[PDB]
Amino acid sequence: VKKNIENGVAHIRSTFNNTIVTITDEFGNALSWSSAGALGFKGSKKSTPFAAQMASETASKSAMEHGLKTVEVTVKGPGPGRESAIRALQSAGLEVTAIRDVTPVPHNGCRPPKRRRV
RNA sequence: AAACUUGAGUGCAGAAGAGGAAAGUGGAAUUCCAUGUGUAGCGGUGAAAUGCGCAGAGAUAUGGAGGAACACCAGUGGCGAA
User: Fold this and answer.
1) How far is the C-alpha of A59 from the C-alpha of A44, rounded, in Å?
2) How far apart are alpha carbons A101 and A73 in whole angstroms?
3) Among A24, A41, A56, A118, who pairs with A88 as Cys (CB 3.0-4.6 Å)?
4) Cα(A27)–Cα(A93) distance, rounded to whole angstroms?
5) A76 in helix, strand or coil?
6) DSSP structure string for A34-50
7) Do A79 and A46 meet the contact criterion of CB atoms below 8 Å apart?
8) A24 in Cβ contact with A52 (< 8 Å)
9) Would the Cβ of A82 be found within 7 angstroms of any atom in strand B?
């Protein structure tokens, strides 16, 4: 009931409303997930870099418990906590081979929602 | 009534163009469906709540369905009577 991997990819989704972190193998398999809402932060605070740092630290701790050593960063969303999440990943002992922002670029398909009037 | 080539067209040699009409091909992305991993949140806001989710949501990986628009080029740029 244990997983042993040495190289992997950490997916970090940071939106202005919340931060979610997970780590997977090189073939995208899920071990554990972390979110600011689960950590305890509610409402606005979930977007703060500190909550992102805590979630990234928890996710990296579980990844290294399963045995991860080298990880590649997969960043999603425009939130401000992406850099804090990456630094927490680095400080957890894992080695960042490279960083890539996989934020989906819609070329021209689909109509975005109405601009807010507030 | 009779001449002219300057206006207006024509011939000859060249130029660019999101001008229009009809078929075909394509990548990104959104939604949905199925399945594997996985746990208690997701989403949202000034802050919240409705709502969705312990029947397994959200995240993640793969495949499928389908509609719609064409990121970069792109520019006091081009084309058209509008």
Assistant:
1) 21
2) 8
3) A56
4) 22
5) strand
6) EEHHHHT--GGGGGSHH
7) no
8) no
9) no
Amino acid identity at A43: G
Residue among A41, A66, A54 nearest A12 (CA): A54
Nearest to A69 by CA among A116, A9, A12: A9
| C-alpha separations of A19 from A48, A62, A87 in Å | 9, 17, 15
The DSSP secondary structure of A49-70, one letter per residue, reads HHHHHHHHHHHHHHHHHHT--E
CA A37, C1' B16: Å apart?
59
Phi, psi of A81 (to 5 degrees): -85, 5
How many other CB atoms sit within 10 Å of the CB of residue A50?
Answer: 12
Q: How far is the CA of A22 from the C1' of B60 (A)?
A: 8
List the structure tokens of A41: 């932060």
